[PDB]
Amino acid sequence: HQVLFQGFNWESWKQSGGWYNMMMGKVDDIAAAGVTHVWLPPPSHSVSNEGYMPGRLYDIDASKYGNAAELKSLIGALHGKGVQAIADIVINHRCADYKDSRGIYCIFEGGTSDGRLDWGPHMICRDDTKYSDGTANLDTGADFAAAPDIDHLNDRVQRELKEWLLWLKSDLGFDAWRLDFARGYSPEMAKVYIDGTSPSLAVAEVWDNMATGGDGKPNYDQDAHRQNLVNWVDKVGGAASAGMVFDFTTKGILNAAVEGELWRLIDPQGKAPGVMGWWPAKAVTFVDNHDTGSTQAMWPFPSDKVMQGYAYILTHPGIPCIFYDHFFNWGFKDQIAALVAIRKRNGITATSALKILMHEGDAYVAEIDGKVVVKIGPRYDVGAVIPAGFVTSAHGNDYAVWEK
Numbered sequence: 001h002q003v004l005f006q007g008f009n010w011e012s013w014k015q016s017g018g019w020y021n022m023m024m025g026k027v028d029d030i031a032a033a034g035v036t037h038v039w040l041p042p043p044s045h046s047v048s049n050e051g052y053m054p055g056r057l058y059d060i061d062a063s064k065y066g067n068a069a070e071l072k073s074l075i076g077a078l079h080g081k082g083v084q085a086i087a088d089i090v091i092n093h094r095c096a097d098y099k100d101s102r103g104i105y106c107i108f109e110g111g112t113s114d115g116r117l118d119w120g121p122h123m124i125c126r127d128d129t130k131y132s133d134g135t136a137n138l139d140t141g142a143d144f145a146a147a148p149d150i151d152h153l154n155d156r157v158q159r160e161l162k163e164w165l166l167w168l169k170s171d172l173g174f175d176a177w178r179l180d181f182a183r184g185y186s187p188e189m190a191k192v193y194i195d196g197t198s199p200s201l202a203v204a205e206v207w208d209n210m211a212t213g214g215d216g217k218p219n220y221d222q223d224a225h226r227q228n229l230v231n232w233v234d235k236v237g238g239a240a241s242a243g244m245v246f247d248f249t250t251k252g253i254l255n256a257a258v259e260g261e262l263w264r265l266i267d268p269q270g271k272a273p274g275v276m277g278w279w280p281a282k283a284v285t286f287v288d289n290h291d292t293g294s295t296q297a298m299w300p301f302p303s304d305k306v307m308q309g310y311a312y313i314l315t316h317p318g319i320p321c322i323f324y325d326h327f328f329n330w331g332f333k334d335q336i337a338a339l340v341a342i343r344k345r346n347g348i349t350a351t352s353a354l355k356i357l358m359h360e361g362d363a364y365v366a367e368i369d370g371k372v373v374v375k376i377g378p379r380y381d382v383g384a385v386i387p388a389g390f391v392t393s394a395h396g397n398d399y400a401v402w403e404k
């Protein structure tokens with residue numbers, strides 16, 4: 001049984017009294033809902049309030065979310081309920097606190113007395129010409145315009161980041177990682193950190209644009225998109241790695257599918273159209289996150305159909321991730337918990353078998369492990385497609401789930 005929960009949103013840094021402190025009162029409900037892992041925000045000092053422009057990595061007390069003590073208390077509370085903690089790891093880029101003789105901000109500060117993480121321009125990708133000194137390797141991935149991109153091919157960088165990552169586990173209690181902007185560096189470099197820090201899991205954010213057609217909707221055939229994702233997993237070590245990816249393919253397709261086009265939810269070979277259909281053990285599914293939804297709303301799930309999104313991911317193969325807002329702010333707590341309960345009760349996991357029974361525009365019906373049936377869509381009656389012996393267990397707006 002594995003179910004993730006993103007425990008923060010884009011406004012979390014503003015929480016009066018601190019986000020971690022506030023989260024202490026949410027721990028019990030999260031655990032009671034069947035969540036096994038909670039994804040927490042970047043914990044270190046960051047030039048940006050949300051934490052995605054890290055500077056002094058060891059300086060946890062500088063975070064807007066809370067200090068080391070408050071974070072250790074939250075992780076301990078989670079652990080007390082058998083729930084693991086995932087840290088949002090931002091290492092593609094990093095902000096340098098100090099200026100060098102050239103007057104450029106390329107002298108870094110780890111946040112400790114000694115020289116740990118006290119890098120210089122030699123650790124900045126040579127092609128990030130604004131900050132580099134030209135002695136480094138070329139960026140192994142995409143660039144982040146607002147800050148220096150780190151040269152992960154550098155031996156000291158690899159050595160010290162792994163040391164820092166191990167410290168996050170030993171000193172704070174973190175169990176796993178969420179790799180931010182994984183397109184910023186190669187999967188071979190991500191492999192270095194994953195293999196070297198032994199996380200229970202390492203879910204990477206590998207987000208590529210999804211091809212669309214003349215009508216502005218995504219193309220039905222998204223194989224190229226999920227191919228990129230499976231390729232990343234293969235290069236990170238595949239089944240021999242704790243690494244996995246967020247299923248952005250399923251996110252993109254589902255966004256469009258619920259708008260009267262549920263026929264998009266199956267490929268020509270009868271499998272799920274996203275990563276879930278090719279490598280479910282490595283696909284972390286979701287309805288929305290702090291980027292796609294929340295205040296940024298880069299690619300929001302149709303708001304009136306959010307529960308259809310959860311009926312889908314919480315019953316299907318792959319590892320589902322629940323978004324904080326939908327559970328504690330929107331009124332879907334009970335409905336979401338009921339779906340996770342069905343998942344757990346029936347022993348459904350990431351590799352459970354998926355048999356799609358109907359995939360028409362107004363109705364999608366699927367059977368999982370021959371033990372659970374789920375239906376989403378505006379078409380009310382699908383009774384004719386429900387196998388004998390199944391009885392309705394949970395239902396809501398345009399969704400229903402059956403069990404035996």
Ligand SMILES: CC1[C@@H](O)[C@H](O)[C@@H](O)[C@@H](N[C@H]2[C@H](O)[C@@H](O)[C@@H](O[C@H]3[C@H](O)[C@@H](O)CO[C@@H]3CO)O[C@@H]2C)[C@@H]1O
Nearest residue numbers: 223226227230231233234238239275277278279280
């Ligand atoms: C479990 C698993 C890994 O062991 C494998 O290394 C992955 O690459 C992926 N393997 C994928 C291919 O990466 C993908 O390209 C497609 O493979 C297709 C080809 O794309 C098509 O051109 C001809 O048929 C093949 C059927 O296997 O589905 C396979 C299941 C699979 O999830």
Ligand SMILES: CC1[C@@H](O)[C@H](O)[C@@H](O)[C@@H](N[C@H]2[C@H](O)[C@@H](O)[C@@H](O[C@H]3[C@H](O)[C@@H](O)CO[C@@H]3CO)O[C@@H]2C)[C@@H]1O
Nearest residue numbers: 378380381382383384392394395396397398399400
């Ligand atoms: C007699 C009967 C069957 O013919 C039907 O196929 C069942 O699924 C069930 N019908 C269920 C819906 O399948 C379920 O989704 C929810 O119905 C939902 C609608 O699906 C939703 O669009 C608006 O809210 C309703 C709640 O009242 O409860 C009903 C009792 C009903 O017992």
Ligand SMILES: [Ca+2]
Nearest residue numbers: 110112113114
């Ligand atoms: Ca220092």
Ligand SMILES: [Ca+2]
Nearest residue numbers: 144147148149
């Ligand atoms: Ca940069």
Ligand SMILES: [Ca+2]
Nearest residue numbers: 052180181291
């Ligand atoms: Ca980003």
Ligand SMILES: [Ca+2]
Nearest residue numbers: 141142149184
């Ligand atoms: Ca980069």
